[PDB]
Amino acid sequence: PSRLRKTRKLRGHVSHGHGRIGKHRKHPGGRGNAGGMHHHRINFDKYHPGYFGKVGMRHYHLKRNQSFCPTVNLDKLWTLVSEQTRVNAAKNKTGAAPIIDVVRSGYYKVLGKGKLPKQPVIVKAKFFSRRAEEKIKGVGGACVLVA
Amino acid sequence: APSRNGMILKPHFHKDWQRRVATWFNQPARKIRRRKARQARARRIAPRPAAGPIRPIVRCPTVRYHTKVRAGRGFSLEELRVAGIHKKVARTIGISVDPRRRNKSTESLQANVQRLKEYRSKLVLFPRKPSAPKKGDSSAEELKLATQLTGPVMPIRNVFKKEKARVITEEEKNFKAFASLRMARANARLFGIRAKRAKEAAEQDVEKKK
RNA sequence: UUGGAUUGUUCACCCACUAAUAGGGAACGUGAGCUGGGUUUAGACCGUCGUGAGACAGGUUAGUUUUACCCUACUGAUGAU
RNA sequence: GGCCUCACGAUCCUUCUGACCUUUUGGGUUUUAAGCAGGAGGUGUCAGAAAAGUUACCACAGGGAUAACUGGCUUGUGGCG
RNA sequence: UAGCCAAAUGCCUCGUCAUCUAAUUAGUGACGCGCAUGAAUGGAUGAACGAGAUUCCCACUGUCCCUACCUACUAUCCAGCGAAACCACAGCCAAGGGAACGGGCUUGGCGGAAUCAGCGGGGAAAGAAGACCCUGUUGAGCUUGACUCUAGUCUGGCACG
RNA sequence: GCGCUGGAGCGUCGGGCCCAUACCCGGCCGUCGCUGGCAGUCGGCAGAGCGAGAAAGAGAGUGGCGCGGACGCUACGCCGCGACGAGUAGGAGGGCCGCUGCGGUGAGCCUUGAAGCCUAGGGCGCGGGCCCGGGUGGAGCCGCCGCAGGUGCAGAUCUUGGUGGUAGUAGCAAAUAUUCAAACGAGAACUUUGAAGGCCGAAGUGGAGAAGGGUUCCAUGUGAACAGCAGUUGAACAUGGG
RNA sequence: CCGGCUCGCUGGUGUGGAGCCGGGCGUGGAAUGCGAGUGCCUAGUGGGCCACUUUUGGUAAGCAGAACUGGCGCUGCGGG
RNA sequence: AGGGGCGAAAGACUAAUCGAACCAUCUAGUAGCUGGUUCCCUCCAAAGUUUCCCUCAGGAUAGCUGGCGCUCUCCGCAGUU
RNA sequence: CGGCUACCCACCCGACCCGUCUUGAAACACGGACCAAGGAGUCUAACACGUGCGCGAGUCGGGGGCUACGAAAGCCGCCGUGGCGCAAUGAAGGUGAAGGCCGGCGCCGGCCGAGGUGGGAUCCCGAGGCCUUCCAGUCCGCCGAGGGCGCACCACCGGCCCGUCUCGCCCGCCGCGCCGGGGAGGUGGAGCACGAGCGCACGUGUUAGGACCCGAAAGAUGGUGAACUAUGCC
RNA sequence: CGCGACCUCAGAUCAGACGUGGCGACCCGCUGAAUUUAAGCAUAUUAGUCAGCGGAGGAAAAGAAACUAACCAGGAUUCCCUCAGUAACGGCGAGUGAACAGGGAAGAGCCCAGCGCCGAAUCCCCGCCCCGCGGCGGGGCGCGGGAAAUGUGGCGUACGGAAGACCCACUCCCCGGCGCCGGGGGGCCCAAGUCCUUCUGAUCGAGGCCCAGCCCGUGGACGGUGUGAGGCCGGUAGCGGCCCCCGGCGCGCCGGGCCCGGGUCUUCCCGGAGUCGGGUUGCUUGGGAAUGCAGCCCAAAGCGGGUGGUAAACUCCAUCUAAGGCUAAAUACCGGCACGAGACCGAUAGUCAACAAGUACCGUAAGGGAAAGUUGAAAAGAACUUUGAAGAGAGAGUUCAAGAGGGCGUGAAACCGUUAAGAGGUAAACGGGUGGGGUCCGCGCAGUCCGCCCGGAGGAUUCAACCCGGCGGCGCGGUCCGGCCGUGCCGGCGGGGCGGAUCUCCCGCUCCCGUCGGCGGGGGACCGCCCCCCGGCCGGCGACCGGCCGCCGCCGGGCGCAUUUC
Ligand SMILES: [Mg+2]
Ligand SMILES: [Mg+2]
Ligand SMILES: [Mg+2]
Ligand SMILES: [Mg+2]
Ligand SMILES: [Mg+2]
Ligand SMILES: [Mg+2]
Ligand SMILES: [Mg+2]
Ligand SMILES: [Mg+2]
Ligand SMILES: [Mg+2]
Ligand SMILES: [Mg+2]
Ligand SMILES: [Mg+2]
Ligand SMILES: [Mg+2]
Ligand SMILES: [Mg+2]
Ligand SMILES: [Mg+2]
Ligand SMILES: [Mg+2]
Ligand SMILES: [Mg+2]
Ligand SMILES: [Mg+2]
Ligand SMILES: [Mg+2]
Ligand SMILES: [Mg+2]
Ligand SMILES: [Mg+2]
Ligand SMILES: [Mg+2]
Ligand SMILES: [Mg+2]
Ligand SMILES: [Mg+2]
Ligand SMILES: [Mg+2]
Ligand SMILES: [Mg+2]
Ligand SMILES: [Mg+2]
Ligand SMILES: [Mg+2]
Ligand SMILES: [Mg+2]
Ligand SMILES: [Mg+2]
Ligand SMILES: [Mg+2]
Ligand SMILES: [Mg+2]
Ligand SMILES: [Mg+2]
Ligand SMILES: [Mg+2]
Ligand SMILES: [Mg+2]
Ligand SMILES: [Mg+2]
Ligand SMILES: [Mg+2]
Ligand SMILES: [Mg+2]
Ligand SMILES: [Mg+2]
Ligand SMILES: [Mg+2]
Ligand SMILES: [Mg+2]
Ligand SMILES: [Mg+2]
Ligand SMILES: [Mg+2]
Ligand SMILES: [Mg+2]
Ligand SMILES: [Mg+2]
Ligand SMILES: [Mg+2]
Ligand SMILES: [Mg+2]
Ligand SMILES: [Mg+2]
Ligand SMILES: [Mg+2]
Ligand SMILES: [Mg+2]
Ligand SMILES: [Mg+2]
Ligand SMILES: [Mg+2]
Ligand SMILES: [Mg+2]
Ligand SMILES: [Mg+2]
Ligand SMILES: [Mg+2]
Ligand SMILES: [Mg+2]
Ligand SMILES: [Mg+2]
Ligand SMILES: [Mg+2]
Ligand SMILES: [Mg+2]
Ligand SMILES: [Mg+2]
Ligand SMILES: [Mg+2]
Ligand SMILES: [Mg+2]
Ligand SMILES: [Mg+2]
Ligand SMILES: [Mg+2]
Ligand SMILES: [Mg+2]
Ligand SMILES: [Mg+2]
Ligand SMILES: [Mg+2]
Ligand SMILES: [Mg+2]
Ligand SMILES: [Mg+2]
Ligand SMILES: [Mg+2]
Ligand SMILES: [Mg+2]
Ligand SMILES: [Mg+2]
Ligand SMILES: [Mg+2]
Ligand SMILES: [Mg+2]
Ligand SMILES: [Mg+2]
Ligand SMILES: [Mg+2]
Ligand SMILES: [Mg+2]
Ligand SMILES: [Mg+2]
Ligand SMILES: [Mg+2]
Ligand SMILES: [Mg+2]
Ligand SMILES: [Mg+2]
Ligand SMILES: [Mg+2]
Ligand SMILES: [Mg+2]
Ligand SMILES: [Mg+2]
Ligand SMILES: [Mg+2]
Ligand SMILES: [Mg+2]
Ligand SMILES: [Mg+2]
Ligand SMILES: [Mg+2]
Ligand SMILES: [Mg+2]
Ligand SMILES: [Mg+2]
Ligand SMILES: [Mg+2]
Ligand SMILES: [Mg+2]
Ligand SMILES: [Mg+2]
Ligand SMILES: [Mg+2]
Ligand SMILES: [Mg+2]
Ligand SMILES: [Mg+2]
Ligand SMILES: [Mg+2]
Ligand SMILES: [Mg+2]
Ligand SMILES: [Mg+2]
Ligand SMILES: [Mg+2]
Ligand SMILES: [Mg+2]
Ligand SMILES: [Mg+2]
Ligand SMILES: [Mg+2]
Ligand SMILES: [Mg+2]
Ligand SMILES: [Mg+2]
Ligand SMILES: [Mg+2]
Ligand SMILES: [Mg+2]
Ligand SMILES: [Mg+2]
Ligand SMILES: [Mg+2]
Ligand SMILES: [Mg+2]
Secondary structure, X not given: OOOOOHHHHOOOOXXXXXXXXXXXXXXXXXXXXXXXXXXOHHHHXXXXXXXXXXXXXXXXXXXXXXXXXXXXXXXXXXXXXXXXXXXXXXXXXXXXXXXXXXHHHOOOEEEOOOOOOOOOEEEEEOEEOHHHHHHHHHHOEEEEEOO | OOOOOOOOOOOOOOOOHHHOOOOOOOHHHHHHHHHHHHHHHHHHOOOOOOOOOEOOEEEOOOHHHOOOEEEOOOEOHHXXXXXXXXXXXXXXXXXXXXXXXXXXXXXXXXXXXXHHHHHHHHOOOOOOEOOXXXXXXXXXXXXXXXXXXXXXXXXXXXXXXXXXXXOOOHHHHHOOHHXXXXXXXXXXXXXXXXXXXXXXXXXXXXXXXX
């Protein structure tokens, strides 16, 4: 609110908090990003490196659906399915392993980052990382690819 | 004159934006107007569903949404002819029809036909003349029990198939997913060039042996 | 500590008288005291420079000089303690 | 690279060179084009605008930060002792 | 080249000579290697004329020596009616210092109500956000061998053909 | 500056004295620091302390009458010690400083007198400002807790409006000039009449048109306002004509 | 300081060097003074001037241009 | 009839406006340049300096400043010797 | 009789008129006769930082729908679609974030398992001691030599991920190929290395908007004027 | 030569109709800058924006793919969120900047040309008769006229259609004339104090209205009434009442219009040309070897053409069918009509305008453009007397009030006069310190009391201690009895709700000859959490207690009797 702003305590001071030698003029340094190459060179090089110039190829008609591929990690892999699935699989004596369809959850690619608990799984995903697959194989499990 | 550190901004306010600005001060009034028109429509079609006709099961085109099922525009002609429903009577009984839909699959076509059969089973058709019932009209005792239904008729829900836990086989444990993915990528990329190399080799070896 | 010829002249030179015709300051004293002769608006013409518009501490010509009744100062004039 | 202290140049664009390099977008092949890296073409106002004059017919915002008038400090010069 | 000149054109220059005066940077007539004259960017001349710019002479006169007086209307006073510019507060000087020329500050000189008629020394008096000079990455009139273009114009192709 | 010459001058000096917001002590205000102390008001359900140079318990267990005791403590509160206090541009914090409206709240105020305004009245607060007393007023007004802003003026050759000095001043000085008697009238240098003296001097200060103005033309009444004095007059005002 | 490992670097030489562990020594190894360290956001500023001493141009300047320090600016007060 | 008219030509006249008329709109045109910038108290407290810029009346960037804190104590630091 | 304060007068000392620009202002620098009223950093959006609240690897109904003040308020959850965050790197094809030990023939089974060092607030243990006559003596506390597990955080050494360079030897097959994968050592990255974000509100700073208020010389668009004057004609 | 047709073009005050212009907030088509930014400026930016022109509607436009995509595919147009400040464009500088998919609001599809098939089976106008006519229509009679074969109407349009044959198969569709039934536009109305005192000028102010705590309340919004009123009045609430006009429905007859449909098989047909496209030029766009549009030139094809975001060639695919047209809905609104509201403004504010305001007034014109509200409850607007000609005073009177006297509520400051006080030759004025004089204030002028004790004069229904009743507190009672809760737990031959990505008899759906092999739903079991019931422990009742007993305190009523108490 304007009650608590600084302008309420600036009344009585001639310059209104803007200086007496250099008055608060309209646009002493140009409009917007003016003179980035000329008189704002130091600021645009000390704080915006790479700002000037092009790089890379140009993709004219880019559609995000083609490149849409959310990823999940093995630490969160068990979080997708309910707790009772994991506890029953751990208690299970016949060696049956739960099947985790990460696609139904909404992740296409599985990346292996965290520690995977010692428990057989069947991860049914769309893509797999090399380390993710070898962790699943090492802990004991299967990887199923779906389209 | 930018400050010490911060973003570079390019606001789109250089035009005369104040001259063309839309304010939502009529948002609650428009909500009430929509609500009153919706209720007036609902009471106008006394026994017909408020949401209107029935729309088919449809899954979204793009890769991002091919795992989800949404509502369709209308039932395809091929689906209707399989179900034995005429294209001119379907709209009269309250079935959405659009002739532009194709059918490149089979399970989706069967699902729509099954839904159409269920809709005809659930539908209660009043006689055209109340005094004189006809062959296609519903019974008198079930006529009195007809009423509207709120929301869409037979809403489309994303049915999920769950499979029970199984024992992992040795072939599954020996399957190399990452190797299979990379090898498939390489084969797709280099399919044509290998073919032209084989053709060139054959067409050059034949000259050597001729 | 002058009268004059010449020049807008400050300077300068000459004629005559005299006693001497000494030098300077006061916002280069003094434009709400004057004049506008010259610089220095806008019009013009000559010469030089520039393709040109134009320039010329080179020359020539015509070219609006506003106001005091206010305070003080000074000149006088009533009066006042 | 020159015994050392100097002898030289960003963005974008163009040109050349290099990979059995990537993309050319619904798939395959080949020209072409676009990419990555390393050089060259350039800015001498040299941290890099693409740039001829006049205005006395001039205009605007300002500046005693900045001249020509007067006024101050020194007196080179001028005058005087 | 013919012509012409210290010209309305000559810096040096107030050129040199003669005349015009007692005295002339003025005027006129001459002389010319003329900073930088000159032939239709016209030269030279020339009767008449010019509210054009110059020098001299006769007459004339207050322009002056050297000021004086008279008239009409103001100014002056009264009756009636009656504004405006301008105004930080205001208003006596000398020196000192100071933002380098004070009315106020310091030291002195001193100062005495309300006032009338003149006057132009000062108020760095009043009008106008200096027109001169400079700055501005502020312009406008104009010019061109400045940059970029454009009407129009000439030419070629295509269609009418 | 006055003035000063057995200095009130000059050079070397001795005592004494003079005073700054400086220094020492003291009072008050505020800031900072000790990130100090206080829930211990533990009372006939009791025993009154943890200032003292020295790290830790006025600690517990096994054997040899009278019915009494001040304040405190809105802990965003209170209290104790020290040091410090300048300030442009600028920054931050506290405002029980100020204005307008909104949600709550004061069994708020008020025709037995609100806001506003004036006041040589009583005060408070450093200060922003505020509360009472006296006079006019006749219909609304305020305190606290939160919210919101078109929220505080000495200037900007500021905008609008009003009023001073100038000042009863400048001026009412272009075109020769008025005088006498009477009338109306309350009032006459200015109207009317009569007489005299004048001017325009037939390219006029005369008589009539066009453009332009539009009732200014005529009669009566008024003298409120205007005709830069005044008016008994008007091209002024009001009535009716043309 | 004392032991013990590691090394693909360098080597006559368990040579050199570096790294990593274990063990021991408190008279806290000049004086004086002082609680320190660290991270974000940020206004205003970006025309200066003067003075002792050093010093450049100019004869000189209340001139112009430098270095240290202190002031004015931003600052009142006693004295001149 | 306005970048047009007209000019025996002075940039003259074009409704008191002419080296480009008047009215309305774009338009509250832009300004690195002047002027102003409104209540109290307390606390802290500067710079006119480096570098770069068609930069010199300005900015960006360091430096100076304030605010907010945070990590520790009852070893460290110093315009000093 | 008292009343400092508020009215007037007298005296002593001090005392130049304010604002603004400036290194320097009382200035012979500009604005200012006086008074009353109005009057100038506001609002929208974006970002950053700091602070308050809710939830928390989730968070947010802002759009839509269901039920005087109320155009409010509540609810949706199979309306979380979607934004932000939870994963970065590369131009892209793409890839995408610990390992060590034991036995057998690079591969198989089992074990340990998600860094180290220095400084690190706090916590844990305790060589003894805190007395009422003196001795042994227990329980509740308190202090303490010394020794530890060390928050957050800082510094260094390691490790892992993506691009790139070099030296390389192996591994896999549905299509043994100009196939795919793996190591060590340097290097570039806005990375990981046991979350910290999302929504709302407040303050500050910057920006684009008229943008603290007033101010041009100019430019463009559309219309009105030859009743003055310039010129031609009747 | 003439007569009679057709074709092109005229003249009609010919009969019957239509367009013209205006508003223009929103919308459609065209034209279209410079301010500004880029710290200059030329490309860009401002910006398909202002200005200018044309055309409507209640909405307009658009609109049912020559579409989006490359996926397991969606499926008209339009609008919100999101995509996204992204792809992309840009002196790659300043800056500009979409689209797909997804979630919603809404959702509605269709019709010609062409190819064909039916005796032009079609349509318009005039004359007459009947019916209703203030949306000129329906039926019938005209060897009445005309349009049209240079193509009207029926079938029929990319989703196939038509015709023939074979099977199945329905009649109630549709108007409009007349006529009987149960949602709006206005009119007239509906509850309760002027109750008793009391101020006032007037009350709507203040007190009371019982043991019907005045009356009404589905009505305590507002306004007016001599203040500030739920009850005085209008209205207010009401699924409250009465009257008139009209409306969408649900019936009846009446006239005619059509006697129409689906599946299988056989045969034929199927498309819009100066148009696409290519070259070039110009504008636009994010569209970048050219997104869109336009001018010129070339200018087609039909297993063809378009699109598939990098130009081209070859080759398989995916998706539509351009050059014809219609269509409500969701959407925009600063013009207009009638309304409601506001954390807005309160007469220098707010629209320029609260009032005889786009009026007065100025300019030739285009245009510019104000200042200006408040008597009083009621004019009760000051009778009458007096001086003056009058303006205007002095009395008197109205009003509570003229201290409200016709621009009249309140009435500041600058400014001016008068009265009173003080001072005055260094312009005025100011800060510190006093002194003097005035103004009022201290209702001051014999000066505070408050507790305990002593002493003297007194007056009470009087203290302590006991009795009864009531109330409260207290861990009383180490462990009284009974209830309640746990953001505590345990047991359960208990009765349930929620969730689960934990498993597993019945029904519906599709392929095969009642069966073997599949999907969806329901049911059952299991687990987690929660609700209730029973039993057993822990804690609390100091966010959450009841009955006894014990102690204490307090209050009332007695006995208390004056060496106590007040
Ligand atoms: Mg300040
Ligand atoms: Mg200033
Ligand atoms: Mg500045
Ligand atoms: Mg600014
Ligand atoms: Mg540059
Ligand atoms: Mg800044
Ligand atoms: Mg819907
Ligand atoms: Mg003379
Ligand atoms: Mg002079
Ligand atoms: Mg003069
Ligand atoms: Mg003079
Ligand atoms: Mg002259
Ligand atoms: Mg001239
Ligand atoms: Mg006079
Ligand atoms: Mg560039
Ligand atoms: Mg391509
Ligand atoms: Mg000239
Ligand atoms: Mg001089
Ligand atoms: Mg000399
Ligand atoms: Mg002479
Ligand atoms: Mg001569
Ligand atoms: Mg010549
Ligand atoms: Mg010549
Ligand atoms: Mg007089
Ligand atoms: Mg004085
Ligand atoms: Mg003078
Ligand atoms: Mg000027
Ligand atoms: Mg100026
Ligand atoms: Mg510059
Ligand atoms: Mg220009
Ligand atoms: Mg050129
Ligand atoms: Mg201070
Ligand atoms: Mg307000
Ligand atoms: Mg007063
Ligand atoms: Mg009243
Ligand atoms: Mg003022
Ligand atoms: Mg006079
Ligand atoms: Mg006259
Ligand atoms: Mg006449
Ligand atoms: Mg007359
Ligand atoms: Mg008069
Ligand atoms: Mg600031
Ligand atoms: Mg500056
Ligand atoms: Mg500087
Ligand atoms: Mg100097
Ligand atoms: Mg300064
Ligand atoms: Mg200082
Ligand atoms: Mg000082
Ligand atoms: Mg001295
Ligand atoms: Mg023309
Ligand atoms: Mg000229
Ligand atoms: Mg112009
Ligand atoms: Mg402005
Ligand atoms: Mg300080
Ligand atoms: Mg500048
Ligand atoms: Mg004094
Ligand atoms: Mg100033
Ligand atoms: Mg300045
Ligand atoms: Mg100066
Ligand atoms: Mg000053
Ligand atoms: Mg001076
Ligand atoms: Mg001046
Ligand atoms: Mg100035
Ligand atoms: Mg002035
Ligand atoms: Mg004010
Ligand atoms: Mg924060
Ligand atoms: Mg985003
Ligand atoms: Mg910032
Ligand atoms: Mg702003
Ligand atoms: Mg302006
Ligand atoms: Mg321009
Ligand atoms: Mg004329
Ligand atoms: Mg006719
Ligand atoms: Mg029209
Ligand atoms: Mg610019
Ligand atoms: Mg600019
Ligand atoms: Mg420019
Ligand atoms: Mg463009
Ligand atoms: Mg454009
Ligand atoms: Mg366009
Ligand atoms: Mg327009
Ligand atoms: Mg339409
Ligand atoms: Mg179609
Ligand atoms: Mg779409
Ligand atoms: Mg654009
Ligand atoms: Mg979409
Ligand atoms: Mg036909
Ligand atoms: Mg009322
Ligand atoms: Mg009552
Ligand atoms: Mg009422
Ligand atoms: Mg009542
Ligand atoms: Mg009533
Ligand atoms: Mg265009
Ligand atoms: Mg292809
Ligand atoms: Mg079509
Ligand atoms: Mg079409
Ligand atoms: Mg249409
Ligand atoms: Mg409302
Ligand atoms: Mg008014
Ligand atoms: Mg008022
Ligand atoms: Mg107004
Ligand atoms: Mg007024
Ligand atoms: Mg009034
Ligand atoms: Mg008023
Ligand atoms: Mg009264
Ligand atoms: Mg009154
Ligand atoms: Mg009243
Ligand atoms: Mg009044
Ligand atoms: Mg007196």
